[PDB]
Amino acid sequence: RIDSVSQLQNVAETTKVLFDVSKETVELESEAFELKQKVELAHEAKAVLDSW
C-alpha cells in the first residue's frame, strides 16, 4: 500500500508545475500570432517588389 501511496506523493507537487507551464506556453503562442501577421505583410511586399 505504501508503494502505491509514494507515486502519488511526488505527482501531487510536480503536476501543479506542468499545469501552470502548459498555460504559460499557450500565452507565448498568442504573441507568436503577432509575428505571423508581420511575416505575411513582408512576404506580400517582397513579392510585389519582385514583380516590379
Add this chain to the structure above:
Amino acid sequence: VSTLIPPKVVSSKNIGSAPNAKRIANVVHFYKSLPQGPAPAIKANTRLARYKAKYFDGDNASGKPLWHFALGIIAFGYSMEYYFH
C-alpha cells in the same frame, strides 16, 4: 492545449486496491495488539492447578495423567471389592 485536471485529483485509490481492506483490518488488529497472548490454560486450582500444569499444559502430553486418572477409578472399585467381599 491546456492540461486536464485528473492528475491532481485522488480520492478513490483508498477503495481502489485490495490492501485497503487489509489496512482497515490491521489498523484495528494491530494498534490494539498485545505483544503476547493471555493463557494456555491455568485454572484447576486446589493443589490440582499443579496437576493440570504438569500434565495437561502445552508443555507436554505424556502418559502420566492417564496413569493417575486410571488409578483413581481403580482405587474406588478396589476398596469397594473388600466392601463386596
